[PDB]
TrEMBL record, chain A:
Entry's family note: Belongs to the eukaryotic ribosomal protein eS25 family.
GO cellular component, one term: ribonucleoprotein complex
Highest taxon in the source lineage: Eukaryota
Organism of this sequence: Candida albicans (Yeast)
Classification lineage: Eukaryota, Fungi, Dikarya, Ascomycota, Saccharomycotina
Keywords recorded for this protein, A-Z: Ribonucleoprotein, Ribosomal protein
Record bears the keyword Calcium: no
This protein's name: 40S ribosomal protein S25
TrEMBL record, chain B:
Residues annotated as domain KH type-2: 19-81
Range covered out of full length: 4 to 84 of 251
Organism: Candida albicans (Yeast)
Family: Belongs to the universal ribosomal protein uS3 family.
Name of this protein: Small ribosomal subunit protein uS3
Domain of life (superkingdom): Eukaryota
UniProtKB/TrEMBL annotation, chain C:
Pfam families: Ribosomal_S19e
InterPro entries referenced in this protein's UniProt entry, alphabetically: Ribosomal_eS19 (IPR001266), WH-like_DNA-bd_sf (IPR036388), WH_DNA-bd_sf (IPR036390)
Native source organism of the sequence: Candida albicans (Yeast)
Any one GO BP annotation for this protein: translation
Gene Ontology, cellular component aspect: cytosolic small ribosomal subunit
Keywords, in A-Z order: Ribonucleoprotein, Ribosomal protein
Record keyword Flavoprotein present: no
GO MF entry, a single one: structural constituent of ribosome
TM ranges: none
UniProt similarity note: Belongs to the eukaryotic ribosomal protein eS19 family.
Gene3D superfamilies: Winged helix-like DNA-binding domain superfamily/Winged helix DNA-binding domain
Protein name as catalogued: 40S ribosomal protein S19-A
Residue segments, region Disordered: 119-141
Compositionally skewed regions (Basic and acidic residues) per UniProt: 122-133
Automatic annotation (TrEMBL), chain G:
Signal peptide: none
Homology family: Belongs to the universal ribosomal protein uS10 family.
Organism the protein comes from: Candida albicans
Gene Ontology cellular component list: cytosolic small ribosomal subunit
Keywords from the UniProt entry: Ribonucleoprotein, Ribosomal protein
The protein's name: Small ribosomal subunit protein uS10
Amino acid sequence: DKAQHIVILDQEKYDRILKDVPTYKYVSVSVLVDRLKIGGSLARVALRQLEEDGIITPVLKHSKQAIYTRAQ
Amino acid sequence: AILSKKKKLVADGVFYAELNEFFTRELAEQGYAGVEVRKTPSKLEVIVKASNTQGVLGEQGRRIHELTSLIVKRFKLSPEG
Amino acid sequence: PGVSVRDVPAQDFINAYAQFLQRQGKLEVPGYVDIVKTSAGNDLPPQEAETWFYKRAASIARHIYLRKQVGVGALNKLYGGAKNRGFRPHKHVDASGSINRKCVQALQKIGVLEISPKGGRRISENGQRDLDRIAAQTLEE
Amino acid sequence: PLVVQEQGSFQHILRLLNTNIDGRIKIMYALTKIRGVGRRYANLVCKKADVELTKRAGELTQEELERIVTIMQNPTNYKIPAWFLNRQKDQVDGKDYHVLANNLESKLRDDLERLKKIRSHRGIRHFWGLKVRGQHTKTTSRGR
Amino acid sequence: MVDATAPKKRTFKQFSFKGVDLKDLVEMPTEEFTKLCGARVRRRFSRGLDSKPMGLIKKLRAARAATEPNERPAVVKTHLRNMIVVPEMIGSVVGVYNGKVFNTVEIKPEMVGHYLGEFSITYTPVRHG
Amino acid sequence: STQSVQTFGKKKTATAVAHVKAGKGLIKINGSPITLVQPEILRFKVYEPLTLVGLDKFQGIDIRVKVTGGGHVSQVYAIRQAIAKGLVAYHQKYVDEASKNELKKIFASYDKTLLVADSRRMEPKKFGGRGARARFQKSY
Amino acid sequence: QQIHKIRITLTSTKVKQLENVSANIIRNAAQYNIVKKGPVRMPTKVLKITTRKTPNGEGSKTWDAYEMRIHKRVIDLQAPASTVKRITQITIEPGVDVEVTI
Amino acid sequence: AHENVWFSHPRNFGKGSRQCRHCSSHSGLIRKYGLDLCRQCFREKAADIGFNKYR
RNA sequence: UUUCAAGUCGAUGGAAGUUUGAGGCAAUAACAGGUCUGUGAUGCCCUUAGACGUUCUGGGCCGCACGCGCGCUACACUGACGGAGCCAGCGAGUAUAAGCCUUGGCCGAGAGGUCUGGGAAAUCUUGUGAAACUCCGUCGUGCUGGGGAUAGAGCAUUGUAAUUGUUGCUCUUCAACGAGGAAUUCCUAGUAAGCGCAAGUCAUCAGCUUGCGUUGAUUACGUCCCUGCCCUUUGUACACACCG
Ligand SMILES: [Mg+2]
Ligand SMILES: [Mg+2]
Ligand SMILES: [Mg+2]
Ligand SMILES: [Mg+2]
Ligand SMILES: [Mg+2]
Ligand SMILES: [Mg+2]
Ligand SMILES: [Mg+2]
Ligand SMILES: [Mg+2]
Ligand SMILES: [Mg+2]
Ligand SMILES: [Mg+2]
Ligand SMILES: [Mg+2]
Ligand SMILES: [Mg+2]
Ligand SMILES: [Mg+2]
Ligand SMILES: [Mg+2]
Ligand SMILES: [Mg+2]
Ligand SMILES: [Mg+2]
Ligand SMILES: [Mg+2]
Ligand SMILES: [Mg+2]
Ligand SMILES: [Mg+2]
Ligand SMILES: [Mg+2]
Ligand SMILES: [Mg+2]
Ligand SMILES: [Mg+2]
Ligand SMILES: [Mg+2]
Ligand SMILES: [Mg+2]
Ligand SMILES: [Mg+2]
Ligand SMILES: [Mg+2]
Ligand SMILES: [Mg+2]
Ligand SMILES: [Mg+2]
Ligand SMILES: [Mg+2]
Ligand SMILES: [Mg+2]
Ligand SMILES: [Mg+2]
Ligand SMILES: [Mg+2]
Ligand SMILES: [Mg+2]
Ligand SMILES: [Zn+2]
């Protein structure tokens, strides 16, 4: 009951995402949920765009598992 | 009428089983051993093995004649068949 | 060498034929597609409301390509699945007849299939022509 | 088809048909909180109101919220099939209806006395709180 | 949600069953009546009415004709408890077998469309302790 | 006609019949290239008979198999056996047996099921239980 | 009504007499220069019936598993109808029944 | 009158619609392959019919 | 290794090296074990016309404060849905009936309806295009899109007859259950576990059995510690044999 993860993305969290995700060894749906406090559905759209924006390199593609890494 | 292969071989067996018990009840006193049904064209040969073939074929073969009639009238067989 | 339907993966070929069939727009879509569920064993309608009919018609077309005189009754069994009987064990139940029958009827007037002799629905003279075409525009990337 | 941001437009708590709806639930499953509105029914009223299901409850504007409650209260006027409705071939007026949050238990109740007033067997077992649909009660339903 | 109000209205309301009020309901023929009730009832009349249901109706009609000071129409007894109540037999009193006794019921208008034996429980309810 | 050999591989119920003809190296599964086998996690099970010997062995031969029966996984093992057995059987008939024994050595040293069909079959069920060995739970 | 493509269907429970009649007909179809096709072994059908052992309902739940194997063979002959029927009387056997269809 | 009531209830498509060849019983009937024999009567006649135990 | 014996354990070859895997049959006697509710199998007793025979109508065998046993669903993310991919084996099937398996076409959201045709069957249903499963999406730890009882309203099928809902379908309601105490069951390889399919009962109804196949392991390959049985020795005042 204590989760209360944020599902709407405001501006303070948005640039915090783009400031924190690059400094990650390994990002995934749970990694985004665990540390950014965002919901699972919001994490999935974030990963699919961050890959389209070039910040994130896709190590492996799968529906149930998305393995991503830093592009730097 | 039109009877399947599975249901036809079973019917022959069921006919044999019912016919065999019929002889056991009727010809019990004559040491009835068994019956062999030899199918043939235009005829249904039935061979009965008994200790005494006089009780079945008695008084000018009256009983065997009167006993084959009980099978034509129960299985709807032609009198010559 | 040439290209056939059998030379391309099934899952992404249907996604390509579905896209063409929607953009072409000539396929007639029945009016209840936004309401109905695909099977009586299903509990919810398809999640891709705008496109589920096109993709299913694409799947039906591809499945008929590889076989000979498949009926509409066989199509219900193919797309049917395990029903969620509450406490009783699961069982396979066929899909809806109208959805499949409308697709093949809709596909029959777009030119890809036709009623085959001795039952079923054959692929049309032009049905082979245009499916093999889509396969080529699938694998260039 | 990408992440977007908003400020001050989200509404945490909604009130529809005198029922409180959590605003952070997806719209299709938020309406299922309204009693008398299931997942199957909520999927169609959102599709009849041209409200794409990819929106949370708070994302909706007032214009959309009123457009949904209008459809739920008048389903047949929006090409919603009769067989899809909650209360079809009504007892008194014979028309197809879909009862909602506060109306459902009232007309559900009215059916119970209507069974009990004629003293039918089904109404009697309903009165006793036992199963009415022929279930065996010798070994099941022993809680309280 | 906008708003809601429930100001219920009337007009000397007569009891009504699926859009048909009691006045027209009773003198509708049972052929027409079955067309506006449930699936089970509609199937039963299409399957063909054997002599037993029709014979009870004829006796029930006569029992009402026996008395014309407008009191209760005297009891007709029957075993056929698979009878479907029709508007023609509203107000009649029937004795319905429960296996042992003739439970007596008076056909109220709200009983229409139900099975005749559904108002006569066949078992005395269990009472532990 | 031409140099054609026909073989088969088997798993539990799945049986894959392989036709190995002389040609440009055409290798299809039920009329579809092996590069698009549905079990992708297991796509390397049928790639093993290829990369073990080297794709150069398939320049002169084309293989078309028809696999039926069994299940999804059981069919993959049947296909890879028909291919492995087909390549060996072609060498024994149209190439020197020295090469055929060479190919058979690498295959056997890697996986016995490439050439030898697995003999395991399902045990029959016996009454008194829901399975072959399993029995209904007992109560006292 | 002369030389015909004629089918003889052989069914029986026991294979020894079935193969004797089958071989005897083939033998007679060999010395007589009659082209033949067969015999064709149809997949044998196992008629299985599984009852409970107990006439009552007491004891361990034990079951019998009875069987009735049915073997069916069809032989195709190219001969006039008079020739094939008399061949049947040559190879008549009580166990095996014969049906002839054109 | 009485003939229209005596044995008047339908006795088709039921368990009482059929009976054993041997014992004319209603319970435990075997209808496979048109045997129409009781399961108890079948065991005592199985060998005669041609059913044997092999496995 | 071994009494160099019976054998056992490793390799190699092999399709198969656990009795090759699995079953069927199965000794000398015995039990007051269970069935006279399988028998036109039976002795005796009871009844035999107001029947305890048989038949017809209706109800009951389902009845519900409770204790117990065989099971089925689940408690979620190794997952639910939504699309898409799409693979078995064991089997069964009719006529002047009293109606079998039913494709294909056409209606219907479904359930289901209708018109033709095939099959007495390796021919047609049927490749029974089964389900788990796999891919791509939605969901995002929430009694939540887990779970689907209970119940309201409605639509079809079978049947003379569905009320005490036969079953199926549609909408709605959406309960306990958040992995279970003391105890206790089954199991060693295509085995266990899932997962379905067919046959039996069957006008209708399979959460049941009998089989079949799909996916497919963990852990011993040992012991007498518990439990049961067998053998040897022993005691006995038991032999109807400790229910002595
Ligand atoms: Mg499927
Ligand atoms: Mg599916
Ligand atoms: Mg489930
Ligand atoms: Mg379930
Ligand atoms: Mg019960
Ligand atoms: Mg009575
Ligand atoms: Mg053995
Ligand atoms: Mg005793
Ligand atoms: Mg007695
Ligand atoms: Mg008795
Ligand atoms: Mg007895
Ligand atoms: Mg007696
Ligand atoms: Mg008796
Ligand atoms: Mg009994
Ligand atoms: Mg019996
Ligand atoms: Mg009496
Ligand atoms: Mg009982
Ligand atoms: Mg009751
Ligand atoms: Mg009761
Ligand atoms: Mg049991
Ligand atoms: Mg038990
Ligand atoms: Mg799903
Ligand atoms: Mg799925
Ligand atoms: Mg077939
Ligand atoms: Mg819930
Ligand atoms: Mg659910
Ligand atoms: Mg429910
Ligand atoms: Mg124990
Ligand atoms: Mg029943
Ligand atoms: Mg069944
Ligand atoms: Mg049972
Ligand atoms: Mg011990
Ligand atoms: Mg002594
Ligand atoms: Zn019997």
